[PDB]
């Protein structure tokens, strides 16, 4: 298996730990080996091995930001196939059932605001801007990939309604003021319950991290938990103007296509079908 193949590395990084006891979350680009208090990122393709140095450097930069919560901190890096040991953020995700409690929502939203605030502030820092990437015309490049790859798979009516969504992207300004997680899903935000009310342990999965528009992350929160909750976060954070709502609404439309676009490339039939549900 994957554990047997890397037993030499695991014996070094995790001395005495039985490899077959561990779990391996086979992600998209990396193969993270889940240990008790840490994980071990390994590149699947050769291209991922080339980016791992800067990825490791990026993760260290994120570790020195005041986000009001933990992030995977680099512990070790080398070769054998390059590797990166990151700290395991404790706590589990939060289901939408919990937000039905009003007092919980206040707390959860407030800590989300503190997180997004820290990300916003960090984007101003010159050091952070140099460390992290900031692609120009990511949406127009995205639109071209969608038009190339997904349009053939879509219906006539689906292409119309898709083109309207891609048309909206050109209206958006190319903002690069804040740090953007890029995939701020519910399962990527970990929480501490059973002590008091939920307390944000930390965020994980920063593979789509960049300097960009913070609406992207707000949209992700809205995709996870919905209208009423996002409104609460916007009102507390003071991001409830029309232009911000427009940017959020516009970006959220692409989430279905982004799922399909990725699934198309890595031959995921279940994801591709789900992403194209409306578009055919």
């Amino acid at each position: 298996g994957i554990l047997q193949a890397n037993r030499v590395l695991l014996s070094r990084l995790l001395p005495g730990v039985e490899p077959e006891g561990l779990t391996v979350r086979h992600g998209q680009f990396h193969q993270v080996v889940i240990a008790s208090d840490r994980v071990v990122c390994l590149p699947r393709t050769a291209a991922a091995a080339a980016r791992l140095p800067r990825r490791a450097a990026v993760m260290r930069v994120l570790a020195g930001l005041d986000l009001g919560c933990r992030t995977p901190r680099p512990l070790c890096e080398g070769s054998a196939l390059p590797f990166l040991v990151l700290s395991r953020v404790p706590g589990a995700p939060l289901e939408a059932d919990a937000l039905e409690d009003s007092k919980v929502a206040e707390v959860v939203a407030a800590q989300y605001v503190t997180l997004l605030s820290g990300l916003a502030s960090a984007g101003a820092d010159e050091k952070v801007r140099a460390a992290l990437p900031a692609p120009q015309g990511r949406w127009r490049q995205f639109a071209a990939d969608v038009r190339a790859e997904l349009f053939p798979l879509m219906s006539d009516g689906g292409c119309r309604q898709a083109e309207r969504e891609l048309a909206a992207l050109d209206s958006l300004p190319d903002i690069t003021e804040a740090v953007v997680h890029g995939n701020l899903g519910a399962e990527n935000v970990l929480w501490v319950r059973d002590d008091g009310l939920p307390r944000l342990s930390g965020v994980i999965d920063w593979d789509e991290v960049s300097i960009g528009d913070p609406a992207e992350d707000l949209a992700a929160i809205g995709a996870g938990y919905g209208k009423d909750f996002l409104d609460q976060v916007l009102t507390l954070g003071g991001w409830s103007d029309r232009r911000m709502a427009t940017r959020i609404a516009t970006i959220r439309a692409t989430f279905a296509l982004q799922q399909a676009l990725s699934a198309c490339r890595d031959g995921d039939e279940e994801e591709l079908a789900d992403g194209l549900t409306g578009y055919r």
Binding site: Q28, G182, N183, L184, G185, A186, N188, E208, E216, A219, A220, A223, G224, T254, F255, A256, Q258, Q259, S262, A263, D268, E271, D274, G275
Partner: peptide, 6 residues
């Protein structure tokens, strides 16, 4: 993998 983006 997923509608949040992944």
């Amino acid at each position: 993998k997923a509608x949040r983006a992944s």
